[PDB]
């Protein structure tokens, strides 16, 4: 079988869409192509492929008649086509679907839209006559939910834009569908609009949802006769017992570190969407800190929201090492430690204010395919604090689909941040930014990107540490690999999401695969490159680390796990590589 009888176009322009019931589909595709090219009389006589071709016809205009219950200007605009355009069956179908959608917008749930082109062969033109019957307005009598055997009905009815006892809007139901997808509590959402048997003008709306399991709270204790007892445990949840409250409580206790954190929040404190929540934490590592914060926030439009809150943290340090950056800070604070003398202490009570702004137009909770998200967070100190500073972090991500089936997608992921002191004071060094690891740039050891400490005499560990740590040998300034973090950072990654031809159906909605290229850098400020001219200049922002690789994301029964491998291409002295990485994500 081949293509026979084409003179307007050659077969090389047509066979490219053929697989040579597949043939019936290819023949319908070719017929649609010709109809969309003005060939009003194009058809197929028989399959052997004997083609009959016509000429090209141009549209003369569109007439519309029928039971148009107002909105005539909108219909005219939808059907307004400039004269001279070629006849196109697809355009006609599109116009009919746009009319149906427009009518649905105002409650005409079941319009009847049909059209018939008049083909003028003496003069090659097509005049279209459209017959529209708007029908009656529909009202929603009951809204019901099925499948929600764990979550409370109160949750599903708040993520809705269609109220009972009012006219139907198709877009007002679809918005509900999207908001439920944005909640992140369901595997799938679908809809139905079944007519009420007792009246031609009333319809019910039914949503089908399937909840995924969440939380997976863990615990465990390491133990041995050499290692002793090491306890770690915690619980995390997004939809605790189905009430919509988020909970996070974790902690650990061992012979070198002890800490705990609790964070609880209510996305809907009030009926109109005002949210409240907060957290408490304690972490004593053998330096200690502890504190609390409370945040309130609310929406300002369908896509944007604001947050703000207050809190307090206590920070107490001791036995600090003689680092140049740390001592610069301490001197800026008025401290005068003795050179290379480990005997020291410092503690402050810092009262702060934090705030932020978000935007979220993503289509899915965990595997978005379109849209973008922006998260801008600021933090400032207030009078009465010992450390006067501000910070800003911007985190954005945009998904752009390529494929109609959304298998080919390009993701832009970027993060930037900065911060500084007030009044001529320095930023505390324990608030510095770090990068590297699966959360930022893959292929590098965690918190290894950035400038490193230079060490300068008394210590209780003198004999055991490196020669520049031991105070019998630590006679001068030494370079080290001990990352201290910085006051500025930037990270970016370009990730391509592709099909997964190597997975079975059970993974069809659980496994995503992508290719990526990562870049980023961390740098400082207030770096006196003259005094420390014998070491690298940390103020140079051009030493950007770069790597690329492949990753797979799997929404396993135990939560979102990420497996990846990447290799570096751009590395600077002092960096440490890590080529194979795996982490539990519970983010993105």
């Amino acid at each position: 079988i081949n293509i026979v009888g084409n003179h307007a176009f050659t077969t090389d322009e047509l066979i490219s869409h053929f697989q040579l019931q597949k043939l019936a589909g290819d023949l319908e595709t070719l017929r649609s192509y010709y109809l969309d090219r003005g060939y009003a009389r194009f058809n197929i006589d028989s399959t052997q492929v004997n083609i009959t071709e016509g000429d090209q016809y141009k549209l003369s205009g569109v007439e519309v008649s029928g039971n148009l219950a107002g909105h005539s200007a909108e219909i005219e605009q939808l059907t307004k086509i400039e004269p001279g355009e070629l006849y196109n069956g697809t355009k006609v179908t599109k116009m009919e679907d746009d009319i149906k959608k427009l009518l649905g917008r105002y409650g005409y749930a079941y319009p009847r839209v049909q059209s018939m082109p008049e083909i003028n062969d003496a003069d090659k033109t097509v005049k279209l006559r459209v017959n529209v019957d708007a029908g009656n307005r529909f009202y929603v009598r009951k809204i019901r939910f099925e499948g929600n055997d764990t979550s409370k009905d109160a949750v599903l009815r708040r993520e809705m834009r269609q109220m009972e006892g009012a006219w139907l809007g198709s877009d007002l139901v679809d918005q509900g569908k999207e908001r439920l997808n944005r909640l992140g509590f369901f595997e799938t959402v679908d809809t139905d609009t079944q007519r009420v048997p007792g009246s031609p003008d009333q319809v019910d709306v039914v949503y089908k949802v399937k909840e995924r399991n969440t939380g997976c709270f863990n615990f465990g204790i390491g133990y041995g006769t050499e290692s002793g007892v090491s306890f770690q445990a915690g619980v995390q949840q997004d939809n605790w017992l189905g009430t919509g409250y988020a909970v996070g409580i974790n902690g650990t206790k061992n012979d070198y570190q002890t800490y705990a954190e609790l964070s609880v929040t209510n996305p809907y404190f009030t009926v109109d969407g005002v949210s409240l929540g907060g957290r408490l934490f304690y972490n004593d590592f053998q330096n200690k800190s502890y504190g609390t914060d409370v945040t309130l926030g609310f929406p300002i439009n369908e896509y944007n929201s604001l947050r703000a809150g207050l809190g307090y943290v206590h920070n107490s340090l001791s036995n600090m090492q003689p680092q140049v950056a740390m001592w610069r800070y301490l001197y800026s604070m008025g401290e005068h430690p003795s050179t290379s003398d480990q005997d020291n202490s410092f503690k402050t009570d810092d009262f702060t204010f934090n705030y932020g702004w978000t935007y979220n137009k993503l289509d899915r909770g965990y595997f978005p395919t379109d849209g973008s998200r922006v998260n801008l967070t600021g933090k400032v100190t207030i009078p009465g604090s010992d450390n006067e500073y501000y910070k800003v972090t911007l985190d954005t991500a945009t998904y752009v689909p390529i494929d109609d089936d959304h298998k080919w997608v390009v993701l832009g992921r970027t993060r930037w941040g900065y911060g500084d002191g007030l009044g001529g004071k320095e930023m505390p060094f324990y608030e510095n930014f770090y990068a590297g690891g699966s959360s930022t740039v893959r292929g590098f050891q965690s918190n290894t990107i950035g400038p490193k400490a230079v060490y300068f005499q008394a210590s209780n560990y003198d004999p055991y540490d490196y020669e520049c740590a031991t105070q019998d040998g630590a006679k001068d300034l030494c370079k080290s690999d001990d990352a201290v973090g910085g006051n500025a950072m930037a990270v970016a990654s370009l990730e391509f999401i592709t099909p997964t031809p190597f997975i079975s159906d059970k993974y069809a909605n659980s496994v995503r695969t992508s290719f990526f290229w990562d870049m980023g850098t961390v740098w400082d400020t207030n770096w006196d490159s003259s005094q420390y001219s014998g070491y690298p200049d940390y103020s140079d922002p051009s030493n950007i680390r770069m790597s690329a690789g492949i990753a797979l994301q799997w929404m396993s029964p135990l939560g979102p796990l990420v497996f990846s491998y990447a290799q570096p291409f751009k590395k600077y002295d002092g960096d440490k590589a890590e080529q194979f990485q795996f982490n539990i994500g519970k983010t993105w």
């Binding site: 399991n213 939380g215 997976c216 709270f217 465990g220 006769t225 029964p557 135990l558």
Partner: peptide, 24 residues
């Protein structure tokens, strides 16, 4: 040394490092 009871119900012990996970 290790066994599961149901999907997302996992316990291990393996001197030893006892750990348990359970999903809702």
């Amino acid at each position: 040394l290790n066994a599961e009871i149901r999907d997302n119900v996992r316990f291990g012990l393996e001197a030893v490092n006892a750990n348990f996970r359970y999903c809702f």
